[PDB]
Ligand binder design. Structure first.
Ligand SMILES: N[C@@H](Cc1c[nH]c2ccccc12)C(=O)O
Ligand SMILES: [Ca+2]
Length: 342
């Protein structure tokens, strides 16, 4: 009666506070729920859809290390959940090809993320790779190879999983019922704003606070935190609405009555930003300290990182063999000869 959950990330580097708020907290909630069996993909094949230079591919090993350390440090549990490496699941390549054959190109090119990449490519006199166009087909293979029931994804990925549902329906219609139609689990509409107040917090915008930033670094990034540009002087009445300083206090400062007093004094102008910022840094550091302590243990004994990925990959490999046996039984391309050739 247990439902399968699958979600994860391309390995791109260290995790930041936006990852925690936007997706990691929900992944812990799902993992701790007895109704679910969680699979967390480290999607190294998907990095090739945009990063193919040898120097970029070389860094994937490092990115996987950083992902495992951050995931385990916040409590993603490798015995309860299956943390696995996408490229290490041999069946993914064949299921990807099968689904490619079942997906009309016009159903991919209308996906808003793909449409935007295609418009930018044309603008720049480039052409997207066949593999990048196939991004949601490969993601559909990830989800359905696990026969997942529930898929947490960010807003820009929901349409990918809508394609996954259509691929499951097409396969089941043509060849008989094999795949659950996955349900999308939606996140918040507002990703956490970055430290410069310009868009979401992201590695590429260089406006992130990383879960692994040390105390001094958190202090410096909060010191330079974008606030209210109209608050010219320390005595000027300020705006709390839209203000990253108070967006962060609400999320990370547990002392609710202090935050409400700061907000009032800020609107009245009778508080220095240094007071509100020093306290924000103190509370983010207190929030981060237990992560840092566990991450330090994992970095000191990397066998825990290796065991995590070994255990999860072996669990996903088992599931993938069982799923593909069912796929072969229902699709049955050259079934007799492939038996003869086994
Ligand atoms: N597309 C996700 C990674 C990913 C690959 N396969 C998935 C399956 C389910 C959820 C997420 C994924 C990302 O942008 O990082
Ligand atoms: Ca081992």
């Amino acid at each position: 009666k247990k439902k399968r959950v699958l979600t994860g990330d391309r390995p791109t580097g260290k995790l930041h506070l936006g990852h925690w708020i936007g997706s990691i907290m929900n992944r812990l909630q799902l993992q701790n729920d007895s109704r679910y069996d969680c699979f967390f993909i480290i999607a190294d094949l998907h990095t090739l859809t945009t990063k193919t230079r040898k120097e970029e591919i070389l860094q994937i090993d490092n990115h996987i290390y950083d992902v495992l350390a951050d995931w385990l440090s916040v409590g993603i549990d490798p015995e309860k959940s299956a943390i696995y490496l996408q490229s290490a699941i041999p069946e993914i390549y064949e299921l990807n090809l099968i689904f490619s054959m079942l997906t009309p190109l016009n159903h991919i090119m209308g996906i808003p993320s793909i449409k935007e990449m295609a418009r930018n490519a044309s603008l720049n006199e480039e052409s997207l790779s066949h593999g990048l166009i196939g991004y949601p087909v490969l993601q559909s293979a990830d989800i359905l190879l696990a026969k997942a029931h529930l898929v947490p994804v960010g807003k820009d990925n929901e349409a990918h999983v809508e394609l996954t549902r259509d691929i499951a329906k097409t396969f089941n219609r043509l060849y008989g019922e094999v795949f659950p139609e996955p349900d999308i689990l939606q996140g918040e509409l507002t990703a956490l704003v970055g430290t410069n107040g310009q868009g979401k917090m992201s590695k590429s915008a260089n406006n992130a606070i990383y879960l692994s930033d040390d105390a001094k670094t958190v202090q410096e990034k909060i010191r330079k935190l974008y606030t209210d540009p109209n608050r010219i002087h320390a005595t000027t009445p300020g705006r709390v609405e839209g203000n990253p300083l108070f967006i962060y206090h609400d999320l990370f400062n547990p002392h609710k009555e202090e935050v409400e007093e700061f907000k009032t004094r800020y609107r009245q102008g009778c508080i220095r930003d240094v007071e509100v910022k020093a306290r924000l840094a103190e509370e983010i550091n207190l929030f981060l300290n237990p992560f840092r302590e566990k991450r330090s243990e994992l970095v000191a004994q990397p066998k825990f990182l290796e065991e995590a990925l070994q255990q999860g990959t072996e669990k996903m490999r088992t599931v993938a063999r069982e799923t593909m046996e069912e796929v072969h039984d229902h699709l049955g391309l050259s079934r007799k000869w492939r038996t003869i050739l086994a």
